[PDB]
Design a binder for this molecule. Structure first.
Ligand SMILES: Cc1cc2nc3c(=O)[nH]c(=O)nc-3n(C[C@H](O)[C@H](O)[C@H](O)COP(=O)(O)O)c2cc1C
Ligand SMILES: Cc1cc2nc3c(=O)[nH]c(=O)nc-3n(C[C@H](O)[C@H](O)[C@H](O)COP(=O)(O)O)c2cc1C
Ligand SMILES: O=c1ccc2ccccc2o1
Ligand SMILES: O=c1ccc2ccccc2o1
Ligand SMILES: O=c1ccc2ccccc2o1
Ligand SMILES: O=c1ccc2ccccc2o1
Ligand SMILES: O=c1ccc2ccccc2o1
Ligand SMILES: O=c1ccc2ccccc2o1
Lengths: 358, 358
């Protein structure tokens, strides 16, 4: 099942293996470079059906860190063009995740402290969010409460980013509404304490996300998959109520033209108890898929090829996202094809490799 | 031992893992392209101490196939510059193998027949060699016997190639005197039937190789390793006599400034019986190392990390060359570091990978 193709709108993936967005923290002032080119091109040649580029900020302040990729100008977008073209030459579908880190912005690279940047560090910047409340823990900075104009500006930033992504040749877009960043923080009552149209009720908390989706849909081609990543629960002791609301929003996403949902955990606050384990998201993704009638992918521990295969056969997932295993071995799809007994497994790879590995 | 550094002349490799030349057959009219850039850069980031670029023809007719890389003009050399710079940025030493395919030239890509190109195929060309005798089998073309001017011209081609390699920034050069191509074919009595100064006696058969080495040494910096690959036996029933002469030539190579010998099998003729097996070259490489007092590397089946480690501990090898395992997994050095219990094995890789794999 892992090596059956998948067709969504006009796009066909050669298999069900997706490489999820994985931030590299190697960009400079948002501009990607040869780190990203070789990294992504090498992954595409590894055999995966879909490669989703790391979180790419729609605005400078929406980067997580000083090394995050950005697409907030045409020059930033044009930098993606040769990379997109290399992914395509390798036969993988190029996708990109567009993002805004919200209150989690202005942080250090994970191997450089992983924490909010010190006040007098010239690299740092003010963060913005639905409400002036800090994440806490290693991210204690209190964000600035967004004005209605801020909200309009960020929505337009998402539109501009999607427009650029389209024109750079991406065939698959993913709105980053997960992992506690801006979009996730608008939906969660933990972080959203607004009393205007963007806070309070379920309708109001959903509003930012739904409007951003609608605005993006105006510029993103109908025949190319339009997707999002969304944390559907927090493991914060409110899981049944949170999952119910998240599934309801997924229904609204679908009605608003969303083709597939990448199902994640919220990470909106630090005080949680996540039951980490191989493929632990499987049952959650399946419930979203069933109850919203929407294709899904998810991640965490699917680098064991048999787990990926089991998830697909059980219809918990439509695509299986495999992250860290691809940092370890960019040719993981070849490893998986062998593990699963695929005919001519070496031809998961391009000829100059496949010929010799048969 | 596999992860101890190695210093040769002014060059220091971060470990004893070498990626040997592996032809990609993806070049056009000798010019390399983004296939080679991403392929080589990705390998460099995988952790290997030394990356030797595939056989690169010193002249158009010295390509094995229409897809082989070339360095027979300054424009061909300049194309290597960004690749060399990427290898260095990744902390690997960039080397290159310069070559002339001799009677084995003008062949199809291995996945396109692997045989001599048909007479009326517009891609083909006349081959040149010490004597007009065919390899046989899948390479039945009779080469043209080289004139003394041909020999002068090819030596100068090797000099020009080494000069270009130097200027492109390579830190390690390997003369391809192995695998039945031009250099190997001059040394072997099977293929060299000349009656002039370049044939007959051991001195005469060695001459082409020794003069080419001397000529190259004039332009290749003294402080950068000067090496060659050389088939030391054929498994043709003449192994003791052939090994004795090959070791004698290795002594002459050393006296003439050779820093390290990549020990191989000759492949000069098809009628042989090679005892293929994991690390089977080990005992042969050790005998050359001992009897010529010269550092060596070799290859074939060392992708099993424990075999690589054993070879080094037994002083059979100074560097271990690992080829096909790197086509399967460009991050093989990381796999090896884990297998061998290296401290902080993930940091065999660059930070954007290592941080997450610890
Ligand atoms: C280095 C790294 C970078 C990541 N970057 C992103 C990102 O930019 N956006 C995102 O939504 N998830 C990101 N993730 C989360 C992954 O997409 C994925 O969900 C996670 O690694 C779990 O899958 P795995 O066990 O196969 O690695 C990242 C994960 C890692 C390890
Ligand atoms: C695809 C491929 C290309 C190769 N190209 C070259 C080459 O250009 N020059 C050379 O001397 N050897 C070449 N070789 C031989 C390798 O360098 C090496 O000796 C051989 O693969 C055995 O090592 P291994 O078992 O680790 O693969 C090539 C081997 C392969 C599989
Ligand atoms: O959305 C994200 C962005 C970055 C990241 C890094 C490590 C782990 C998870 C992550 O999720
Ligand atoms: O799988 C492939 C096959 C061919 C190719 C050519 C150039 C660049 C990347 C490529 O990837
Ligand atoms: O194949 C791999 C290798 C390492 C690793 C580390 C963390 C998570 C997943 C991983 O997968
Ligand atoms: O010198 C060489 C050049 C190419 C090659 C291809 C496959 C196997 C061995 C080889 O050796
Ligand atoms: O190992 C590395 C570390 C950094 C780096 C930067 C640019 C290109 C390649 C690189 O490789
Ligand atoms: O790791 C590997 C995987 C495949 C393979 C095939 C032939 C020779 C060596 C190999 O090494």
């Amino acid at each position: 099942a892992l090596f059956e193709p998948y067709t969504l709108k006009d796009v066909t993936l050669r298999n069900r293996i997706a490489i999820p967005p994985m931030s590299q923290y190697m960009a400079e002032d948002g501009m990607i470079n040869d780190w990203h080119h070789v990294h992504l091109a090498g992954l595409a040649r590894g055999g995966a059906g879909l490669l989703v580029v790391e979180a790419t900020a729609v605005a400078p302040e929406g980067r997580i860190t000083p090394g995050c990729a950005g697409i907030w100008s045409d020059a930033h977008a044009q930098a993606f063009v040769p990379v997109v073209q290399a992914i395509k030459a390798a036969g993988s579908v190029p996708g990109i995740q567009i993002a805004h880190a919200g209150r989690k912005a202005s942080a250090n690279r994970p191997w450089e402290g992983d924490d909010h940047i010190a006040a007098d560090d010239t690299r740092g910047w003010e963060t913005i969010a639905p409400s002036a409340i800090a994440f806490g823990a290693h991210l204690p900075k209190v964000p600035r409460e967004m004005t209605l104009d801020d909200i309009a500006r960020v929505k337009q930033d998402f539109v501009d980013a999607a427009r650029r992504a389209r024109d750079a040749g991406f065939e698959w877009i993913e709105l980053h509404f997960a992992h506690g960043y801006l979009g996730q923080s608008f939906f969660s009552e933990h972080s959203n304490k607004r009393t205007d149209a963007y806070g309070g009720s379920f309708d109001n908390r959903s509003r930012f996300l739904l409007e951003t989706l609608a605005a993006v849909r105006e510029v993103w081609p109908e025949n190319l998959p339009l997707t999002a990543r969304f944390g559907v629960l927090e493991y914060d002791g409110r899981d049944e109520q949170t999952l119910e609301e998240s599934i309801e929003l997924a229904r609204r996403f679908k009605a608003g033209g969303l083709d597939l949902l990448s199902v994640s955990v919220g990470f909106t606050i630090p005080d949680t108890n996540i039951p980490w384990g191989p493929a632990f998201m499987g049952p959650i993704a399946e419930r979203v898929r069933r109850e919203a009638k929407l294709p899904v992918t998810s991640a965490w521990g699917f680098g064991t090829p048999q787990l990926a295969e089991a998830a697909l056969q059980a219809n918990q997932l439509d695509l299986v996202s495999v992250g860290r295993a691809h940092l370890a071995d960019p040719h993981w799809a070849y490893f998986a094809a062998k593990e699963l007994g695929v005919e001519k497994a070496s031809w998961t790879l391009p000829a100059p490799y496949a010929h010799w590995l048969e």
